[PDB]
């Protein structure tokens, strides 16, 4: 009769990999065969770079005291407030103005390392369009050596309203 | 040991409901206990208005000849070249130009009955935006009386390129 527990991991944590120690509380029958203990246990866990979230981590019979469940942790992606994980890829929503989308603009794409990258656009940018940024993603598990890509996904914000005059011009 | 068979139904067929007769071919042991027949069978099927596709239809032991499988048909939505079914709702993608999206336009929404409906738009239309059209959808099974809605989903087609001059103006 195992037990499941979610393991929250920041996107940067998955980028470089991290040590996460979890505090649990189980039961121990103690020198009686009647009384039960409270005692806890700090289970340490190594999260290897870019682990497809969802990967399971088991701790043998860490459960209670009659046989004790196998306490398992399921890796889960903490929603990040800048990127959307997509496997080894990390999507980056670019909120651009209609003017920018038409007359060209520059996008300072932020990196996991914590740096920025300038990417220029001359041609008309279509809503939905996306520019891939090679290797700016997450390291691939099988080959932590190489990393996935960063994907720019543009959102064109339109103006709220258009003056009676602007209409004329817009032809 | 049953047998499954997909049942292709046009969206209009699901709108009004239809009779669909399927031609199958089974086996019959014949007066021997050795020889086997070829003989077919035209299984008629009543498709009630707006049936959530996927609904199963069984034909008792229509299978072979030793016990014969139960030939079952799974309702499937024929992809329609104008609408996208969404339950009792039918989505309608409106390919509009950026000019139209900004200066207002008129959308002649086509109906399942085979008629058109004019819907006006004054305010700036945003890419992704959608206008619901009450009761223009598919009849609800539980209540064939009332129908679902027709949903307009706009797609703003941007111009391919913008002349060196247009840029200036666009401010």
Residue numbers in the entry:
A (entry chain A), B (entry chain A): 162 to 227, 231 to 335
Relevant lines from the article:
Members of the Hsp70 and Hsp40 (DnaJ-like) families function in specific pairs that form transient complexes with non-native regions of polypeptides to promote the folding, assembly and transport of proteins within the cell. All types of Hsp40 proteins contain a J-domain that can stimulate the ATPase activities of Hsp70. The human type II Hsp40 Hdj1 has been shown to function as a molecular chaperone to promote efficient protein folding. Hdj1 can bind to the non-native polypeptide and suppress the protein aggregation.
The crystal structure of the Hdj1 putative peptide-binding fragment was determined to 2.7Å resolution by the molecular replacement method using the Sis1 structure as the search model. The Hdj1 monomer structure contains domain I, II and the C-terminal dimerization motif. The two Hdj1 monomers are associated into a homo-dimer through the C-terminal dimerization motif. The Hdj1 homo-dimer forms a U-shaped architecture and a large cleft is formed between the two elongated monomers. When the domain II of Hdj11 is superimposed with that of the Sis1 structure, we found that the domain I of Hdj1 in the complex structure was kinked about 7.1° away from that in Sis1 structure. The domain re-arrangements within Hdj1 were achieved by the rotation of the linker region between domain I and domain II (residues 242 to 249). When we examined the peptide-binding site on the domain I of Hdj1 structure, several hydrophobic residues were identified to participate in forming the peptide-binding site. These residues include L168, M183, I185 and F237. In the Hdj1 structure, K181, K184 and K242 are well-positioned to interact with the EEVD motif from Hsp70. The peptide-binding site in the Hdj1 structure is not occupied by any amino acid residue, so the Hdj1 structure may represent the free Hsp40 state.
